[PDB]
Every structure is written in structure tokens, then in C-alpha cells.
Design a protein that fits this description.
Jelly Rolls, 10-stranded mixed sheet, 11 helices, Lysine-specific demethylase 4A, binds O-benzyl-N-(carboxycarbonyl)-D-tyrosine, transcription, binds zinc ion, binds nickel (II) ion, 24% strand, 4-stranded antiparallel sheet, chromatin regulator, double-stranded beta helix, oxidoreductase
Length: 346
């Protein structure tokens, strides 16, 4: 059952596709979650939007310039918040000689220049934009409404959390980065690349996550003492040579326009954008996440403030265990290898 924990790809027919929660349970029955990250190529006649000609006017309220500091494959990224700007401006800068993708043969070559150059000429990421590019009538895999048990949060408390149960758009240019992290509350995530250049990704298997944190702690001892979960600040960059050199297993995969990626609970991932592009993203859940939600180690220094109440989930899906949990005595140990309960039928 994916015993080497490789990153997997799936091409679901239009009908395997229509029901989202069940396609996730399917890929878990096939071993995908063990890699932490998977790719799903939608069926060629599926489409979320007719055209992107019309967005040049859309506002990016808070772009950020990414300053990166470090050497020897260990880096910290600092975010400069810049002035609001529309997409067409962002595109001009992305495609300007100043900021655009260097020329290259194989991916491995672009990968090398990213790692060699990521502290130079800091770029700007149109990150964290509230909104969606899905036509309002598209029903399969609409990041606006996946319809998973994550919806229990909004429904029961009214609470919406931007980018977690609402969608984010991310406008990329060359060399923009996403630091090593698992999702808030260790939720799953979904990323659709609407268009532009690729987004490349690295991933560590959840069953080795602990090994990545142990490591990251030695590498950034200062940050660890000030916060258990410093990685959740999303400021820590670590190259694959370092991972490789300290024997931490990971895989790499490159995502193209029109492709989806899913991350799994507690799957550490990172990457960078190849050039002008645009991805949309949100978090979701399945029954199996609940236990990761109860056990997630959270930012203790209050930079990352996102925190979902588990109560509703435990009561509703783990009735027997509610009281043991509540009196802080639920000692379940997660087994990162199991598919979610919803998968049995496969
Ligand atoms: O789909 C996902 O799970 C995912 O992590 N996508 C990433 C989202 C991300 C994650 C971490 C990032 O680190 C930099 C940063 C952190 C906080 C605020 C603004 C920028 C930046 C972006 C992406 O597409 O760039
Ligand atoms: Ni993520
Ligand atoms: Zn913290």
C-alpha cells in the first residue's frame, strides 16, 4: 500500500470525479496519503472557468516582498508588505526583465538556480487573496464548496477563517516561495493551478514528519526555544540537499496549469513558483483528520493564531471517547498509514 511513500498521480474519469469526498477516500485506499502530497489531473473536459481575460482589474490588497536570509541550504524568509496592486500590474512586474524566469534546459537546472539565487533580488508574491476563480455554476471540485466535514465549523459556530474554510488566490512570479509547513490544525489542503508557469513542490511523508521537526529544531535552535511549532510561522526554508544530507526522506513534484494537488494531514510541504501564475487554495477534512486535529501541536507564541475547536467533531464522530478526551485522557496514537474510514467501500 504505497510502501515507499512515493508521490502519486491520478486521472479520474469525469464520474469518478464528481464526488469529491469519495475521490479522496479512493486515493487514500490506494496509498496516496503516505507521501503527504498527491496530484490529480482532472478529466480533460472539466473546466472551472471559461476564460481569464477578464481579471486584469482584480485587486491584490496586500502583496508581500519576500526577503530571504541564510546560507548552506538553511534560510529564513521575511515578509515585506507592499502596496495594493491589480493583477495586470503584478503581471507587468512578473514579466519584466527584472523579475522573470531565467532560461533553462531541464527542471533540475531551474531548481539549482532557485536554490542558488533565492536570497537575491527579492520577489513579490500576490499571496493570500480572498476570492475564487470558479464559475459559480461549476459543481465538481469547487474550492468554494467541497462539502466536507470541515463545514461543521462554519455551520455550528458561524466561524469563518480566511484561507482555511474560505478560498485564497495566490499570484506567483519566478522565485516566490512557500516555506516548510503542515496545514493549520493539520488539515488537508487543495491547490488548483488556474494558469501560468508551474509550481514545484517538495514533500516529506507524514510518518517521518517528526524527523523533520527534530531536525529543524537543531538547525534553528533559537526559534525552537521561543515556539514549539515555529515551522507554523511559514518562514523556514530548507533545501533538498540538506534534507538528503541528514537522511530525511522527501519527494519532489511539479504541478502544471490545470492540475490539482492535495496535501494530507501532517504532510510537510514546500516549494516555489516558476513564473507568472495563479493558484487557488483552501483546507478540508475527512473523518480521519479529527484525530490529527486533536493532537496538532500549535503555535505557542501567537504569531499563528488559527485554532479550531475540536469539540463539535469529537462529540459527533467519537461519542464514546468524548468524556475521556474532555477530561484530557484520550491517548490514541495516530497511525499515519491508515486510509480514512470512508474508504471501506473500495
Ligand atoms: O496549497 C497549499 O497547501 C500551499 O501551501 N500553497 C502555498 C501557500 C503558502 C504557504 C506558505 C507561504 O509562506 C509565505 C507566507 C507566509 C505567511 C503569509 C504570507 C506568505 C506562502 C504560501 C502556495 O501555493 O504558495
Ligand atoms: Ni500548504
Ligand atoms: Zn509560534
Amino acid at each position: 500500500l504505497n510502501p515507499s511513500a512515493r508521490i502519486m498521480t491520478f486521472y479520474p474519469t469525469m464520474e469518478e470525479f464528481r464526488n469529491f469526498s469519495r475521490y479522496i477516500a479512493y486515493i487514500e485506499s490506494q496509498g496516496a496519503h503516505r507521501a503527504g502530497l498527491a496530484k490529480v489531473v482532472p478529466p480533460k473536459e472539466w473546466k472551472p472557468r471559461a476564460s481569464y481575460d477578464d481579471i486584469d482589474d482584480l485587486v491584490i490588497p496586500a502583496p508581500i516582498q519576500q526577503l530571504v536570509t541564510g546560507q548552506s541550504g538553511l534560510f529564513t524568509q521575511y515578509n515585506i508588505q507592499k502596496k495594493a496592486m491589480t493583477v495586470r500590474e503584478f503581471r507587468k512586474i512578473a514579466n519584466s526583465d527584472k523579475y522573470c524566469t531565467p532560461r533553462y534546459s531541464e527542471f533540475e537546472e531551474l531548481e539549482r538556480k532557485y536554490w542558488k539565487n533565492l536570497t537575491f533580488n527579492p520577489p513579490i508574491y500576490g499571496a493570500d487573496v480572498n476570492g475564487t476563480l470558479y464559475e459559480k455554476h461549476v459543481d465538481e471540485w469547487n474550492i468554494g464548496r467541497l462539502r466536507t466535514i470541515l463545514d461543521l465549523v462554519e455551520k455550528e459556530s458561524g466561524i469563518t477563517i480566511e484561507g482555511v474554510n474560505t478560498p485564497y488566490l495566490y499570484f506567483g512570479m519566478w522565485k516566490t516561495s512557500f516555506a516548510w509547513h503542515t496545514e493549520d490544525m493539520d488539515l488537508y489542503s487543495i491547490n488548483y493551478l488556474h494558469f501560468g508557469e508551474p509550481k514545484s513542490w517538495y514533500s516529506v511523508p507524514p510518518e517521518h514528519g517528526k524527523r523533520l521537526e527534530r531536525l529543524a529544531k537543531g538547525f534553528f535552535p533559537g526559534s525552537a526555544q521561543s515556539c514549539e511549532a515555529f515551522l507554523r510561522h511559514k518562514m523556514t526554508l530548507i533545501s533538498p540537499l540538506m534534507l538528503k544530507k541528514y537522511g530525511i526522506p522527501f519527494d519532489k513534484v511539479t504541478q502544471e496549469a490545470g492540475e490539482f494537488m492535495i496535501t494530507f494531514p501532517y504532510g510537510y510541504h514546500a516549494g516555489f513558483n516558476h513564473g507568472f501564475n495563479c493558484a487557488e487554495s483552501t483546507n478540508f477534512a475527512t473523518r480521519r483528520w479529527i484525530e490529527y486535529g486533536k493532537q496538532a501541536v500549535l503555535c505557542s507564541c501567537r504569531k499563528d493564531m488559527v485554532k479550531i475547536s475540536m469539540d463539535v467533531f469529537v462529540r459527533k464522530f467519537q461519542p464514546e471517547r468524548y468524556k475521556l478526551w474532555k477530561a484530557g485522557k484520550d491517548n490514541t496514537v495516530i497511525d499515519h498509514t491508515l486510509p480514512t474510514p470512508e474508504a471501506a467501500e473500495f
